[PDB]
Every structure is written in C-alpha cells, then in structure tokens.
Amino acid sequence: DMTLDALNFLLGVEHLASAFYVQAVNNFTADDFKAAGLAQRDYDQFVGVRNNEVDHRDTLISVIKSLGGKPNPPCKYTFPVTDVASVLKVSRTLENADKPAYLGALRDIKSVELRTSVQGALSGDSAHAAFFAYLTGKAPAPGPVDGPLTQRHIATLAQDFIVSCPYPAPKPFPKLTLSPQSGPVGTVVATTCAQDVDTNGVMCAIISGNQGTLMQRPGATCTIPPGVKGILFIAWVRGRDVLNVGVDDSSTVCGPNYFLLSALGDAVPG
Amino acid sequence: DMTLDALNFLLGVEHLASAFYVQAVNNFTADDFKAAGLAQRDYDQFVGVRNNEVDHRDTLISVIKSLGGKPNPPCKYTFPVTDVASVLKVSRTLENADKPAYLGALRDIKSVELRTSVQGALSGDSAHAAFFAYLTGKAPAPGPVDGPLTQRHIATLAQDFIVSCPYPAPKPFPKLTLSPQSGPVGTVVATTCAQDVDTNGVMCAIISGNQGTLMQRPGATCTIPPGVKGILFIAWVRGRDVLNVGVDDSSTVCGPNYFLLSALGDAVPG
Ligand SMILES: [Mg+2]
Ligand SMILES: [Mg+2]
Ligand SMILES: [Zn+2]
Ligand SMILES: [Zn+2]
C-alpha cells in the first residue's frame, strides 16, 4: 500500500546517503579533516552521521520486512568527492534534501507508531543538516519550518548521484541549474534547464517551508521574493493549476534545485 | 478535541521557549557572546532562534484560532540566567526537550496537512538543538532516533522554569536529580527524587529513542545500559505494567530528567 511505498522510497533515500557516508569514512581520516581546518570532534561526528544513517537505512529495511514488503536494494551511485570540502558539500546537500523527503513521505504513512519512528529519524537527519551547515558557514537553522517535496522532486535533487537503479525508482525531472545558488532576498537567479523546456506559460515556483509556493513569471531568471525563510527549492512549473507544488508535482517541468537563502547564522566577520 | 489539545500543549511549550529567547536577546549582545569565546555568527544564529521560536509560537496561535480553539496565553516564567554559559545551557535544555514534546503531540494530531506543518517545526527545533549542542561541546547528532515523551513528562522537564500558569496546564511529576547528568554507557547515576517516593517496586526507566524504554531495579542509582543512543530520559516508574513509558505516563513516579549520553561528536582533544 501507500505506507509501504513511502517507506521503500525513504529506503531509497537512505540507501544513497548511507552508501555515501560509509564510503567517505573509508576514504577520509581525522587527519584529513584536521588538515582542512576541522577538529577531531567534527570527524567524530562525521563517523556518527555514518552510523546514524546506517541505522536509518537498516531500520527501514526491518520495518518493511515486518510489514510483508520487499525492501529496495541499493542503487549504483557516483559521488563527486575529491577533497574534504567536497565531502562536506555532498553531505550538506544530502541532509538538506532529507527533510523534504521525509516530510513528503510522512503524508502517506498511515499508523501512529510508524509515524513516530519515522519522525524520530527525520529529527536526526535535521540535526545532521545543522551540523553540515555550520561546518560550511551556513546558518544551522535558517528558518522556522521545513516543507515537503514529492518523490519525483526528491529524485530530481538526487539524480546526479545515481548511475542506475535495479528497480523502477521515482523518475527525476530535468535538472534546473541555478546561478547563483545562494544569496539574499531580491537575488536574480539565472535558471537553466538541462532539457529544452519551452518557457511559454512557465512560472518560477519558489517552494518555501514557511510560505508555501510563490509563483511568478520568469524574467530565464527567477527572483527570490520577500517573506520566505529557510532553504528554498526553485522549480519551473507549467501554469498555476497546482498551487501547493510541494505536495503535487503534476505541473513540474524542470527542477527543483536547492537555493541557500541567506539567513542569520551564516558566517560573517567577527 | 485531541488535536486542539495537542496544539495547545505545544503552544505552552513554545510560549516558554519564545519568552526565554526574546528576553535573552534583549539582555545579551554579540559583544557578550564574543567575550565568551563565541563568534558573531553564533549570536546571529541565536537571534535567528528567537525569530524562529516566535514564529513557532505565533503559528500555533493562528492555527488554534482557525480551528475554533482558545489559544493558551503565556505562563509566568523564571530562567536561571547569569552569564552566556547559562544562556546556552538553558537553550540546549529547551531545544532538547522540544523533540519529545513535538513527537508526543504528533501522535494526537489528526490531519495530514496539520501534521506536515507541525513536523516541519519539529525539524527546526531539531536544528536549534544541534546548534546549541555544538556550542556546548556535545555531539549535535548523538543518535539516530529521537523518541516521544508524554505531556506530563514534558511538564516535569520544564517545571523549574515555570512560576505559575493562568490555566490548568499539564502537571509535572516530582523532579528527579541525576548525578552525574552526562557520561558513557555503564555510568552509575545517583538519582534523587524531590519528593519522598518509596522505591519498593520502583524501576529505573531509561527512555531511549532507538531502543525504547529499558527497565531495571535501582541500586538509589540507575546504570546507563548498553545499546541506547542519543539523549536519554531517566525516570522512576512503579512496576512494569507500562513497557513503553514514552507514550504512557500512568506508572511514572519521579522524573524524567535528561541525561547526555556520550557520543561521537562530543568535544574531544585535537
Ligand atoms: Mg541524512
Ligand atoms: Mg525550540
Ligand atoms: Zn537519515
Ligand atoms: Zn520551536
């Protein structure tokens, strides 16, 4: 049923993340982290993230089996890892994307006890995201409310890390490149779609956790509007038949991709 | 109904926290934080926490009104604030307690859209907790899964900050003092109840997010068992008629209080 499908979707998310962290711990040591300016405790927490994500994955496998389901296996991955900076970038990207993934999946999970367990893992990924934000100079808590995205939206965020999957996984939309990918309200973002999408009738969809989706004609640019807070997900949608894009992808034509809106807590002088 | 009651309970939690942060920002400046060894970005994030918690409170008020409810007003508070260290201690305490509060309340909230909003705020408080953990030398993500506590358990955690409430709020259990209040597996914790509770038949209840409640006869001491991860909540319960104490307080006789289990990511040399 939809509960099982939601859990298997989260297992796909956690297969990818756990695979990344397991491999990264094997390829990077505390000395590598210290050479990059980090502390022993930061490497230790990184190992803790690995351990926590192995648990998040293994818990989903167990629960799916207990419900009579068939747990998804891992896909084949590719991670753009060179130096410690790139490890932190991939980590931040994965953990930021966890929140909308879990929030979307929780809409479909039917029992109280199951929701409690899954919410309790979301809380953990949220703590991981705050850690990686802080280590990369971004506010660990850039806004009050994280919002959902759909399974296909999450596949779109993850697509550059997936070589192939041995089952029919949620299909991504074309990637939307954002330049720049961070900045304050009023930033004019140049948006480029990986596929030749006709922008006639397209709206920029700025998907926020606190204000929902804000939609505006592109300039192809999208402008960061006032009032939104937290991480933003920017997509192209065709028309406005869908007003709440975070819960309905039926008008999405490119993206979303993440945009790191400036916030109190970002690194600043002094 | 129970949804309204759960939201009003969370509004009590967020009245207390927002009141603390609003007052603390008025009494402490970035220069105070810098004199304590912190950075401008840490003060900025602290202001962001205030802003986020004002939003968490105000959102609950609005939602309760929209459901035809009567939002709880603030209680009268007392916060043990002297220096910056004490600000961070109170902050960490409040944010750590948010997670079980929201997780318990979510068991009672009936609609998909409401749960999405409330889960999205929990995600934010989880990020706040990770920030304050990191600033105080504790792992920002000490375990994989955060677990629930009941409304009365949350009142017990909060009781030292409440002078009075102008409505019948959830009643605390007697405070359980833990010495020490942090340490690794195997730590023997001396536990003292604020009221003269007879320990004949009492069990130590070690309430973990990953393994549930573990119960053992006291020594009055409780020993941290293997296998638990994350923040622990330690209570005295009478008998074992309740096995899952995080969702049923009907056997609780003292506590819980929090215990900061050592974890990868805690401050360590190098
Ligand atoms: Mg994660
Ligand atoms: Mg909070
Ligand atoms: Zn996870
Ligand atoms: Zn809050």
Author numbering:
A (entry chain A), B (entry chain A): 18 to 236, 245 to 295
Share the article's original sentences.
Here, we focused on the tardigrade Ramazzottius varieornatus, one of the toughest animals on Earth. A transcriptome database of R. varieornatus shows that genes encoding a Ferritin‐like protein are upregulated during desiccation or ultraviolet radiation. This protein shows sequence similarity to enigmatic proteins in desiccation‐tolerant bacteria and plants, which are hypothesized to be desiccation‐related. Our results indicate that through cleaning up damaged metabolites or regulation of metabolite levels, this phosphatase family can contribute to stress tolerances.
